[PDB]
Write a protein that binds this ligand. Structure first.
Ligand SMILES: *[C@@H]1O[C@H](CO)[C@@H](O[C@@H]2O[C@H](CO)[C@@H](O)[C@H](O)[C@H]2NC(C)=O)[C@H](O)[C@H]1NC(C)=O
Ligand SMILES: *[C@@H]1O[C@H](CO)[C@@H](O[C@@H]2O[C@H](CO)[C@@H](O)[C@H](O)[C@H]2NC(C)=O)[C@H](O)[C@H]1NC(C)=O
Ligand SMILES: *[C@@H]1O[C@H](CO)[C@@H](O[C@@H]2O[C@H](CO)[C@@H](O)[C@H](O)[C@H]2NC(C)=O)[C@H](O)[C@H]1NC(C)=O
Ligand SMILES: *[C@@H]1O[C@H](CO)[C@@H](O[C@@H]2O[C@H](CO)[C@@H](O)[C@H](O)[C@H]2NC(C)=O)[C@H](O)[C@H]1NC(C)=O
Ligand SMILES: *[C@@H]1O[C@H](CO)[C@@H](O[C@@H]2O[C@H](CO)[C@@H](O)[C@H](O)[C@H]2NC(C)=O)[C@H](O)[C@H]1NC(C)=O
Ligand SMILES: *[C@@H]1O[C@H](CO)[C@@H](O[C@@H]2O[C@H](CO)[C@@H](O)[C@H](O)[C@H]2NC(C)=O)[C@H](O)[C@H]1NC(C)=O
Ligand SMILES: *[C@@H]1O[C@H](CO)[C@@H](O[C@@H]2O[C@H](CO)[C@@H](O)[C@H](O)[C@H]2NC(C)=O)[C@H](O)[C@H]1NC(C)=O
Ligand SMILES: *[C@@H]1O[C@H](CO)[C@@H](O[C@@H]2O[C@H](CO)[C@@H](O)[C@H](O)[C@H]2NC(C)=O)[C@H](O)[C@H]1NC(C)=O
Ligand SMILES: *[C@@H]1O[C@H](CO)[C@@H](O[C@@H]2O[C@H](CO)[C@@H](O)[C@H](O)[C@H]2NC(C)=O)[C@H](O)[C@H]1NC(C)=O
Ligand SMILES: *[C@@H]1O[C@H](CO)[C@@H](O)[C@H](O)[C@H]1NC(C)=O
Ligand SMILES: *[C@@H]1O[C@H](CO)[C@@H](O)[C@H](O)[C@H]1NC(C)=O
Ligand SMILES: *[C@@H]1O[C@H](CO)[C@@H](O)[C@H](O)[C@H]1NC(C)=O
Ligand SMILES: *[C@@H]1O[C@H](CO)[C@@H](O)[C@H](O)[C@H]1NC(C)=O
Ligand SMILES: *[C@@H]1O[C@H](CO)[C@@H](O)[C@H](O)[C@H]1NC(C)=O
Lengths: 222, 50, 154, 86, 198
């Protein structure tokens, strides 16, 4: 068939008609972005020649191709650790959430770490790590940051934003009650606080349910 | 079958007609010795960068 | 025969390194975008449309992935919307009374100043409107009373 | 280590900022002798969070930092006939 | 090492060129890298084969050089596009993007020409000599649930003020700096206090 681009929608436009929202959803969506790939290394001599001295006596007339090839792969491997540092090591001081998690009805249990410890990871991070799955001179170099360190960086970014809003990004982490942080964020989108405070339980039930649908979507869809 | 490596005693269960076992990407990673029929596991000799 | 083997294997290794360099640059652009989203979606509230989720970005949560990062974008998605009659400005004593922050909306009979993203009517007052010029200029002038908060006290 | 066998460096329980990256969270430093350790991501900071407590700045700094960005590389030309054949 | 990034580019160029030159002294499986030697001590039917081997090796070296130059040029182009974006949004304006024009709240950036690139001097407002206060989402006066217009309700041990969020400047609660919305039943952390009527 000829594909459909969508459903035609003639907007009810007039020179004196407006549509105003009387409600809201509070939506949580996920974005997945690769940050690094495997740090691989090749011994060009052992790949091309292996253990043969005869081939090793040759391949010297070919020049510095081997020194040029493993220099490029080394630059790639060094860049992968630089990629992870730029993404995750964006935080000074490893922030921790308080033992009393009173965030105005908002429930971050599935994104905060659990001490049951499939590493110091969250419930969502445990779902993520299960969902996605040396010879001839080929070696794989471990990343400088372990998965436990990245999850520690991630939990510090998460603890800072829950407790201190955007202040920790600029300077020192300044504590602010949650749902007072959320009232600031409604002001950023043109909603006049107030709508948050008068709908604080609805805005929370909508947030917690939307977070719950992520763990279902991650567990269900391959 | 000529090669280099370390020959551990293996628990691979070869069929009687077979004489050695290959892996993915076709690398000989097991073999049964002609005398005293028994499967051996080949692992590459230790190597790396320094 | 060794030179033929050397030439083929060397070409195979050059091919591998070239495609790794091209893929590494592709990953680096992804890592730079992920590092920009961490700064602008997690460490702040972004005004850029569709940069941090779909809707009006509120806040994002990073989650660690084996070779990447997962952002949990929390956005304010409006709509249980309704329709209203609208005027650019309101004429009262010939002063044109534009709204300070919201929009003029109308029921079948009455007019209000609601905020543009949430419906919250509020009556027309001098506190939430400002006066500029007379009523001859603006095309969509609509007659209405503008309530002076001070006058009832006096 | 997970990166391999390290000879000539002494492992310590202490954790510091990474100085010479070895890998798998292991870094090296010079104190007398060379030490190997698990790198420290930073100083733990439990922010004093409450449902009715706020922190407000009473002053400021005015910081000036530098960012260096490459914009161009050397414009080179190779006469392939001259290079290959002279 | 402050300008290391710029230095890197220079090195990454020079080394490459060096390799190219040092690939002119490789036999590539021929009798010599000096082509005049091959012509001098060989009959052209065999010198042709030797010249062909040298040609293949040198051509492969030059193709490798050109490919790596194209990849590095794409990297430099991405860097230059980022630098142009920073010139537009940090120097020609004030950016609200976090950490795009330095760490802190961006005030203004200054360009400086660097020998083979650009340097941005980002002046940002870094807050903090901070203090701790008690906050309320709203203030309850006459049962009307007042909210701050532009700042935040903060408390000393005894009194309440409306301060701006990034600098401490108390100011007493008034009808001019608050707006009324609803009654006092809904807001969870609402606190009793008087709001001053000018
Ligand atoms: C705005 O939308 C929410 C749904 O997100 C409405 O809340 C629901 O209301 C129905 C009955 O009115 C209940 O059965 C649901 O349990 C509610 N959902 C939640 C998450 O609380 C809300 O009523 C709407 N408000 C307006 C003014 O339309
Ligand atoms: C936040 O949500 C989690 C799960 O979504 C809640 O954890 C449950 O807590 C109850 C009792 O507190 C236990 O019986 C369950 O076993 C827990 N897990 C699940 C999957 O239900 C947690 O209680 C919520 N937080 C708050 C404050 O309600
Ligand atoms: C080859 O023949 C020799 C000599 O008999 C075998 O060695 C002995 O074989 C008997 C019978 O199988 C065993 O009971 C002994 O234990 C074996 N001795 C040793 C030292 O192994 C040998 O197994 C035969 N190899 C084959 C058939 O592959
Ligand atoms: C538009 O809004 C006005 C003001 O809210 C509505 O007029 C009010 O209607 C209610 C009906 O319950 C009465 O109790 C009030 O006394 C009315 N206020 C007046 C007359 O000043 C009007 O009905 C609305 N129009 C609609 C919904 O079509
Ligand atoms: C908005 O559009 C309507 C629709 O055309 C305009 O209404 C016309 O107004 C002229 C003169 O005012 C009349 O002659 C027409 O008969 C009207 N047409 C209809 C269909 O009503 C109106 O003028 C426009 N501008 C406004 C409302 O400010
Ligand atoms: C406002 O209502 C009046 C009549 O009810 C109209 O405006 C009048 O226009 C005439 C002709 O210019 C003037 O002489 C009157 O002084 C005006 N009266 C006012 C401004 O109150 C007009 O129909 C309405 N204005 C609109 C719809 O924009
Ligand atoms: C918090 O600030 C208020 C106002 O700055 C302080 O209240 C003042 O207390 C002195 C002591 O007698 C009075 O003279 C002032 O008139 C008060 N100011 C008023 C009423 O506006 C209060 O003491 C401070 N609390 C602290 C520092 O804990
Ligand atoms: C903010 O948190 C405090 C501490 O958890 C809450 O104080 C509790 O309030 C309930 C009922 O008001 C009491 O039964 C508890 O004994 C209190 N706990 C403590 C430790 O004092 C408070 O309710 C929360 N909300 C506010 C202040 O609006
Ligand atoms: C404000 O103070 C009063 C008592 O000093 C309390 O609120 C009272 O609550 C009762 C029961 O609902 C009402 O009958 C009174 O009219 C209320 N008085 C008011 C609102 O002034 C309560 O301790 C305080 N309110 C808070 C902390 O929200
Ligand atoms: C109300 O606005 C227009 C008025 O012409 C109407 O046709 C349309 O169906 C309505 N739109 C909404 C959002 O309900
Ligand atoms: C909204 O649109 C409907 C359908 O066109 C119409 O009947 C109604 O009057 C409109 N209301 C307003 C106030 O625009
Ligand atoms: C600390 O170092 C000492 C001596 O190097 C060692 O015996 C001990 O196991 C280490 N760890 C702890 C927890 O003491
Ligand atoms: C004030 O609040 C807490 C209360 O325990 C205190 O520990 C903290 O140091 C103070 N906050 C700041 C950032 O000054
Ligand atoms: C700030 O923290 C200090 C130290 O923990 C505490 O004594 C004080 O009561 C706190 N003040 C406020 C208003 O939160």
């Amino acid at each position: 068939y000829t594909m459909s681009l969508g459903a035609e929608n003639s907007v009810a436009y007039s020179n004196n008609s407006i549509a105003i929202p009387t409600n809201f959803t509070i939506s949580v969506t996920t974005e997945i972005l690769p940050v690094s790939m495997t740090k691989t290394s090749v011994d060009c001599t052992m790949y091309i020649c292996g253990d043969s001295t005869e081939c090793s006596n040759l391949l010297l007339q070919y020049g510095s191709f081997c020194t040029q090839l493993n220099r490029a792969l080394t630059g790639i491997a060094v860049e992968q650790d630089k990629n992870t540092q730029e993404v995750f090591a964006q935080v000074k001081q490893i922030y921790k959430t308080p033992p009393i998690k009173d965030f105005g009805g908002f429930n971050f249990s599935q994104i905060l770490p659990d001490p049951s410890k499939p590493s110091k990871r969250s419930f969502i991070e445990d779902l993520l790590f299960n969902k996605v799955t040396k010879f001839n001179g080929l070696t794989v170099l471990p990343p400088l940051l372990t998965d436990e360190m990245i999850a520690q960086y991630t939990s510090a970014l998460l603890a800072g934003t829950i407790t201190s809003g955007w202040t920790f990004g600029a300077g020192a982490a300044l504590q602010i009650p949650f749902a007072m942080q959320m009232a600031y964020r409604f002001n950023g989108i043109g909603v006049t606080q107030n709508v948050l405070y008068e709908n604080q339980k609805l805005i929370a039930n909508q947030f917690n349910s939307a977070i719950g649908k992520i763990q279902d979507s991650l567990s269900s869809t391959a | 079958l000529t090669g280099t490596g370390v020959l551990t005693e293996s628990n691979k269960k070869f069929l009687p007609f077979q004489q050695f076992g290959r892996d993915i990407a076709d690398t000989t990673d097991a073999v049964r010795d002609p005398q005293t029929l028994e499967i051996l596991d080949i692992t590459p000799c230790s190597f790396g960068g320094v | 025969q060794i030179d033929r083997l050397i030439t083929g294997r060397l070409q195979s290794l050059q091919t591998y390194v070239t495609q790794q360099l091209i893929r590494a640059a592709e990953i680096r652009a992804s890592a730079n975008l992920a590092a920009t989203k961490m700064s602008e979606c997690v460490l702040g509230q972004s005004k850029r449309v569709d940069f941090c989720g779909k809707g009006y970005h509120l806040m994002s949560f990073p989650q660690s992935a084996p070779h990447g990062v997962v952002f949990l974008h929390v956005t304010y998605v409006p709509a249980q919307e309704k329709n209203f009659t609208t005027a650019p400005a309101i004429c009262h004593d010939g002063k044109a009374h534009f709204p300070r922050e919201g929009v003029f909306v109308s029921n079948g009979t009455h007019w209000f100043v609601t905020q543009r993203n949430f419906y919250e009517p509020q009556i027309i007052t001098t506190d939430n409107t400002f006066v500029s010029g007379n009523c001859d200029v603006v095309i969509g002038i609509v007659n209405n009373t503008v309530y002076d908060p001070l006058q009832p006290e006096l | 280590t997970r990166a391999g066998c390290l000879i000539g460096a002494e492992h310590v329980n202490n954790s510091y900022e990474c100085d010479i990256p070895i890998g798998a969270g292991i870094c090296a430093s010079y104190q007398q002798s060379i030490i190997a350790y698990t790198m420290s991501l930073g100083a733990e900071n439990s922010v004093a969070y409450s449902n009715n407590s706020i922190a407000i700045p009473t002053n400021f700094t005015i910081s000036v930092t530098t960012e260096i960005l490459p914009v161009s590389m050397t414009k080179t030309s190779v006469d392939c006939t001259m290079y290959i054949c002279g | 090492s402050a300008l290391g990034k710029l230095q890197d580019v220079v090195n990454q160029n020079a080394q490459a060129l060096n390799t190219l030159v040092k690939q002119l002294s490789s036999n590539f499986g021929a009798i010599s890298s000096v082509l005049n030697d091959i012509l001098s001590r060989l009959d052209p039917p065999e010198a042709e084969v030797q010249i062909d081997r040298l040609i293949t090796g040198r051509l492969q070296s030059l193709q490798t050089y050109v490919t790596q130059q194209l990849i590095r040029a794409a990297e430099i182009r991405a860097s230059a596009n980022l630098a142009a974006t920073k010139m537009s949004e940090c120097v020609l304006g004030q950016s609200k993007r976090v950490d795009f024009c330095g760490k802190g709240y961006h005030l203004m950036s200054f360009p400086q020409s660097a020998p083979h690139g650009v340097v941005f001097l980002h002046v940002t407002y870094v807050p903090a000599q901070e203090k701790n206060f008690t906050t309320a989402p709203a203030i309850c006066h006459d049962g009307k649930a007042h909210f701050p217009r532009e700042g935040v309700f903060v408390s000393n041990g005894t009194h309440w003020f409306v301060t701006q969020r990034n600098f401490y400047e108390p100011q007493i609660i008034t009808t001019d700096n608050t707006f009324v919305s609803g009654n006092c039943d809904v807001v969870i952390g609402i606190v009793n206090n008087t709001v001053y009527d000018p």
